[PDB]
Design a protein around this nucleic acid. Structure first.
Ligand SMILES: Nc1nc2c(ncn2[C@@H]2O[C@H](COP(=O)(O)OP(=O)(O)OP(=O)(O)O)C[C@H]2O)c(=O)[nH]1
Ligand SMILES: Nc1nc2c(ncn2[C@@H]2O[C@H](COP(=O)(O)OP(=O)(O)OP(=O)(O)O)C[C@H]2O)c(=O)[nH]1
Ligand SMILES: [Ca+2]
Ligand SMILES: [Ca+2]
Length: 1203
RNA sequence: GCCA
């Protein structure tokens, strides 16, 4: 030792400071008990001193009101756990009570008055704490709301009562109103804020008043919303607080709102590379089945917790060979993933959300200080979250010589533990140091190895999924003629062999049956094992008495319940969640395994509001049963949107609306808007005029107007609209205009592939003298293609990418377009394509039948402009099945050239850049995917690929005119890979032009035929394209000037000038609503109208049935309602804190789906899956449902968010 | 009325 036995046996029982701060202040005070007290008392200030250098992010807020004098107080510490401790409560309680009396407002007054007592705890605890600020408020009838402890508010209101200033307090704490009234705002913060926005918009070319008018209406909101007055009342967003006041009788004199840690920093703490940080200082000098265990580390800030998981990692490496920021490390036996629990409220979040589950905590306490008062709250957390086992590491022991004190704290700790029902007597506790464990010190190196040895033995092997009792959440149910009723889904746990009896429990009287079989798309099996997607055939049960939502379990394994208590986390505004709080009523959907189900929730004691971002326990009561057991995760949703996660804790026992409004709307919907002439056009003209431009003279002008690419952005923007807005209208009658031009154009493309097919298979000028650019790019391109693409399409690629999808094939029409009707009905197929089908058939035990074995496809016709149609081709369905495969593989391979064909996004930005910069061109080919001749493909593609492309194409054509074509081009759009093939042809050529000119190939980007490459590359690109068959559309290709367009977006000197198109005779309210929304979106800046267009909007809004004039939805929710402000929608129906606005939909009618074809589509699709801070992993993908579109409209009520 |  260094003293005697228990020399500190009560030198902490009156202090609570460190152990080696009592074996020290009691050695230079020679066993003087009441001396050491003052040696540390006036020395406990150098402590609090060495702490103000530690950021104090966490803490608590307190709130007291004396008759009508109230006070709000922020006394913050630096941790979740300290803020909730018994002590740090008492201190701020008193410092608060001694403030009503001592009516302070100067922080320093109460500060120093306690600065004594406040260096008393800091020492006892170990955290930089203090009283950061204070203020107070006096009014007539004033009140407060205290949101747990994170945040509190003070409201003073004249003319208000008890259940009102409370509600105004609750609101304030939600909507952080930076002012009491719109007019309150600093006529400086705004005299000059109207002088900065006026440039944002006057630079866009907007005329004086237009920009003014616009900036005003927008500054007008910029205040109302940040002002208690112009804020939608949080318990009634239909009306604003402003109106809530004036309406009751009262007004509000003032408010204070405090939130723990406002404007501090909280400087991000990344736990991951952090371990690496301490470790790098000491780095200087088969069987994968193994169990995966999760542990967490929880203790006092730098009691070594950081260093210990750092020591854990290294010492494990020095011996053996081996979410949201986590470090892993290995044992000869098992694998560990380790997290830190820096916060309570933050750990719970991560545990309800599933992002970080605990199998066993390891509590970390330093032996020189022993348990800190707040260690109670650590064991508490584990207790609350219900961490099954806790292991304990005593850190930094070497600095405690009297081994009597080790056995002391060890005993101290073992007490606290069992105070919260953990087995504190029979729990392992290693005594060691991480500090010298890093420093290679084998003596303490072995202590780490010891703790580990426990992670091995005391935290038990987590029960494997395969080992639990079988269970399969039912995604879908089918009746297969002669095979019987089968269900599909993924087996969650256990095994299911054929013959066994299964229980089908879920939503009705749990029923029972027996497993007839088990199969995948290719294999037929006799057992289904955990993690596998299968179909399971039953007997005796019919498909009308099974629902999706139900599970298929081993009998007695699970049971149906309707009520449970649970721990849920509501997502924040930031994380996709709601952006409004909810209260007593909340009635959302709880999505369980594979289905939404609706329920009511009841808050615990003392809580009546809930906000995005906050944890919360609630007792959920569902509208009908669902198999469940403790620990079952669920999502909480609002019409498809996830807004919270949750886990069932304990399961209990279990003991507004508008139908004439619905009909009123339904009827308006089904009306015809009626007028004299051409409304579409009339709208365009009242628009052209409202912007001071000549109207279209005649239907003739609409489709024959060329914009001027000069002048201000504003001047051009409408000028561009004027040339685009009517360009696609399909109902001008005025023209000898047909689709005969479509076939003329088509015959011309063929005629061209003919030419270039001849020219390209014949480049023997019988000479060398002459070297050509076209020739060189083909050669250069071929070589890059082969390196990107391979010799031939990997069986795997072809295997994971072939699929049915979508619309017509040679055998099915629009009505039978769905993938299920492609597996159902026999599909055509090409002579050359037969081996693939037959290969597919040898591939599966299901039926794969060719209907016909023809070489033809159907050229047909769809709309394009007013001037011309577009011919496409409808392919033999089996041929399609395989063209999607190569299409799918080219789609990946293109990624390596920086082309991403899913994301038109990247081609739009580069269009916007080209737009200010002028260093990028946007180029456009004319009859793009009709000019790619056979010859050209064959020069460019590996022969293996080209063969396969010839196998998979449709060789011959079959026109409406009954005639024929033997295709000269390789393929027509309609073909499941011509879009990716044309992308790759175009990219490869333009990249070659890049090298030939010393430009960076990575500057090339391509989506279909929308090509973007450096502006210098274009004249060359032009010539290459001419050589290889293509014709570049000089009109739509821009390599200079202020204009660029790519993939739907059109830019002018960087301002978006993308137009909108009226494609059709507007006839139904929906038609009009749609045009009026396209107007809205094209003429609104952040919800604020250009007034030139606003008048025209208002004018034509009056053509709609009245109810439809005021029925508004937000943006992003479609077009069956006018886009505007949802909080002033009289038909909006708030129902359980989710608001529902009704929108127009197309009335449908159900059709029989093909049971067999829909089940193949399902099983084939699960086959597709196995070849490919988050909880989208809680939801599935849905059953096949067919419907026919009647021309009538309906009204559906859908979920909206206040903004 | 296909392919993205
Ligand atoms: N099957 C099909 N493919 C299309 C369609 N639109 C674009 N693409 C694909 O991208 C390429 C065509 O770009 P487009 O915007 O249609 O222009 P284009 O019709 O070929 O020629 P143009 O410049 O004369 O309009 C080829 C084709 O595979 C379409 O409506 N149907
Ligand atoms: N595969 C396919 N590609 C298309 C289609 N329409 C346009 N594109 C492709 O995008 C390129 C740009 O043509 P745009 O006329 O600006 O229309 P968009 O690309 O469809 O724009 P948006 O996002 O609004 O749909 C041409 C073509 O490659 C289409 O119907 N099918
Ligand atoms: Ca084009
Ligand atoms: Ca294009």
């Amino acid at each position: 030792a260094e003293i005697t036995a228990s020399l500190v046996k009560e030198l902490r029982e009156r202090t609570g400071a460190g152990m080696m701060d009592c074996k020290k202040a009691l050695t230079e005070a020679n066993g003087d008990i009441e001396l050491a007290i003052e040696n540390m008392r006036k020395s406990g200030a150098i402590k609090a001193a060495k702490k103000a250098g530690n950021v104090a992010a966490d803490g608590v807020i307190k709130t007291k009101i004396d008759g009508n004098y109230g006070i709000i107080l922020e006394v913050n510490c630096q941790t979740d756990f300290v803020a909730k401790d018994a002590g740090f409560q008492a201190f701020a309680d008193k410092v608060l009570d001694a403030a009503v009396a001592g009516k302070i407002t100067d922080v320093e007054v109460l500060k120093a008055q306690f600065e004594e007592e406040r260096v008393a705890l800091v020492a006892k605890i170990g955290e930089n704490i203090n009283i950061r600020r204070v203020a107070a408020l006096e009014g007539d009838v004033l009140g407060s709301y205290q949101h747990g402890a994170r945040i509190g508010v003070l409201v003073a209101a004249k003319g208000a009562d008890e259940e009102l200033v409370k509600h105004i307090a609750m609101h304030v704490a939600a909507s952080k109103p930076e002012f009491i009234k719109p007019e309150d705002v600093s006529a400086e913060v705004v005299e000059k804020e109207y002088q900065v926005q006026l440039d944002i918009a006057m630079q866009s070319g907007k005329p004086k008043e237009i920009a003014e008018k616009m900036v005003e209406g927008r500054m007008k909101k910029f205040t109302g919303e940040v002002s208690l007055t112009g804020q939608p009342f949080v318990m009634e967003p239909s009306k604003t607080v402003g109106q809530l006041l004036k309406e009751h009788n009262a007004e509000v004199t003032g408010f204070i709102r405090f939130e723990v840690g406002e404007g501090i920093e909280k400087v991000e703490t990344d736990f991951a590379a952090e371990v690496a940080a301490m470790s790098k200082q000491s780095h200087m000098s088969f069987e994968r089945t193994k169990p995966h265990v999760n542990v967490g580390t929880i203790g006092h800030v730098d009691h070594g917790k950081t260093t210990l998981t750092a020591a854990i990692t290294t010492v494990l490496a020095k011996t053996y060979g081996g979410n949201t920021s986590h470090v892993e490390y290995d044992t000869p036996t098992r694998h560990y993933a380790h997290v830190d629990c820096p916060g309570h409220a933050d750990y719970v979040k991560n545990m309800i959300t599933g992002a970080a589950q605990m199998d066993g905590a390891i509590l970390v306490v330093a032996a020189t200080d022993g348990p800190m008062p707040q260690t109670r709250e650590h064991i508490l957390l584990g207790r609350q979250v219900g961490v099954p086992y806790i292991i304990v590491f005593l850190n930094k022991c070497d600095m405690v010589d009297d081994e009597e004190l080790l056995e002391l704290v060890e005993m101290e700790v073992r007490e606290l533990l069992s105070q919260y029902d953990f087995p504190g007597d029979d729990t392992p506790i290693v005594r060691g140091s991480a500090l010298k464990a890093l420093e290679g010190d084998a003596e303490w190196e072995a202590k780490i190895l010891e703790l580990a040895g426990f992670l091995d033995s005391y935290i038990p092997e987590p029960e494997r999924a395969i080992d639990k009792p079988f269970l399969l959440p039912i995604e879908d149910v089918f009746s297969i003629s002669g095979r019987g009723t089968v269900v599909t889904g993924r087996v969650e746990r256990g095994i299911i062999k054929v013959g066994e009896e299964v229980e089908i429990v879920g939503i009705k009287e749990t029923q029972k049956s027996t497993c007839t079989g088990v199969e995948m798309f290719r294999k037929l099996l006799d057992e289904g094992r955990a993690g596998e997607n299968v179909g399971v055939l039953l007997r005796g049960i019919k498909r009308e008495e099974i629902e999706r939502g139900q599970v298929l379990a081993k009998p007695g394994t699970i049971k149906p319940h309707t009520k449970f208590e649970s721990e849920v986390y509501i997502l924040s505004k930031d994380e996709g969640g709601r952006h409004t709080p909810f209260f007593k009523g909340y009635r959302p959907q709880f999505y369980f395994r594979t289905t939404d189900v609706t329920g009511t929730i009841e808050l615990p004691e003392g809580v009546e509001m809930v906000m995005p971002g906050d944890n919360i326990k609630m007792v959920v009561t569902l509208i009908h049963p669902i198999a469940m057991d403790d620990g079952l995760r669920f999502a909480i949703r609002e019409g498809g949107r996830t807004v919270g996660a949750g886990v069932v804790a304990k399961v209990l026992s279990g003991a507004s609306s508008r139908n004439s409004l619905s009909a009123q709307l339904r009827r308006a919907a089904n009306t015809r808007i009626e007028v004299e002439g051409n409304l579409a056009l009339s709208i365009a003209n009242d628009l052209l005029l409202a912007y001071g431009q000549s109207p279209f003279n005649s239907e003739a002008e609409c489709i024959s107007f060329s914009p001027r690419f000069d002048g201000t952005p504003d001047d051009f923007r409408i000028n561009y609209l004027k040339a685009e807005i009517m360009s696609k209208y399909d109902d001008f009658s005025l023209g000898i205009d047909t689709e005969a031009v479509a076939w003329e154009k088509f015959l011309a493309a063929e005629a061209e592939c003919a030419l270039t097919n001849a020219r390209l298979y014949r480049p023997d000028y019988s000479e060398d003298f002459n070297f050509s650019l076209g020739e060189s790019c083909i050669h250069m391109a071929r070589r890059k293609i082969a390196k990107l693409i391979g010799d031939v399409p990997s069986v795997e690629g072809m295997l994971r990418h072939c699929r049915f999808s979508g619309g017509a094939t040679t055998t099915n029409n629009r009505s039978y377009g769905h993938p299920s009707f492609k597996f159902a009905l026999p599909q055509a197929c090409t002579p050359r394509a037969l081996k693939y089908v037959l290969a597919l058939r040898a591939s599966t035990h299901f039926d794969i039948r060719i209907s016909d074995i023809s070489p033809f496809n159907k050229a047909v016709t769809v709309p394009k402009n007013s001037k011309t149609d577009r011919c496409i081709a409808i392919e033999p369905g089996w041929n399609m099945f395989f063209q999607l495969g190569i299409g799918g593989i080219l789609r990946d391979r293109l990624r390596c050239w920086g082309i991403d064909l899913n994301d038109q996004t990247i081609n739009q930005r580069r269009a916007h850049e080209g737009s200010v910069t002028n260093n990028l061109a946007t180029v456009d080919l004319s009859a793009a995917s009709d000019s790619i001749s056979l010859a050209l493909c064959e020069l460019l593609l590996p022969p293996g690929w080209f063969e396969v492309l010839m196998d998979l194409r449709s060789p011959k054509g079959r026109l409406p005119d009954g005639s024929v074509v033997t295709y000269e081009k390789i393929s027509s759009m309609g073909n499941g890979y011509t879009f990716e093939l044309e992308s790759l042809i175009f990219a490869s050529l333009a990249r070659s032009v890049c090298e030939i000119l010393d430009l960076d190939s990575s500057e090339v980007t391509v989506y279909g035929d929308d090509i973007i490459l450096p502006s210098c590359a274009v004249p060359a690109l032009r010539e290459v394209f001419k050589y290889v068959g293509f014709t570049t559309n000089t009109k739509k290709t821009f390599s200079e000037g202020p204009f660029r367009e790519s993939c739907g977006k059109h830019y002018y000197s960087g301002v978006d000038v993308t137009p909108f198109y009226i494609r059709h005779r507007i006839v139904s309210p929906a038609d009009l609503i749609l045009v009026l929304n396209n107007l809205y979106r094209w003429a609104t800046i952040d919800g604020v109208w250009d007034p030139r267009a606003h008048s025209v909007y208002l004018k034509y809004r009056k053509l709609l049935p009245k109810q439809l004039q005021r029925n508004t939805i937000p943006d992003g929710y479609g077009d069956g309602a006018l886009v505007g402000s949802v909080l002033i929608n009289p038909f909006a129906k708030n129902r359980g804190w989710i608001r529902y606005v009704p929108v127009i939909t197309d009335h449908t009618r159900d059709r029989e789906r093909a049971e067999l074809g829909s089940y193949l589509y399902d099983l084939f699709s699960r086959c597709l899956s196995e070849s490919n801070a988050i909880d989208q992993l809680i939801c599935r993908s849905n059953p096949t449902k067919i419907s026919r579109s009647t021309g009538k409209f309906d009204i559906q009520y859908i979920a909206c968010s206040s903004r």
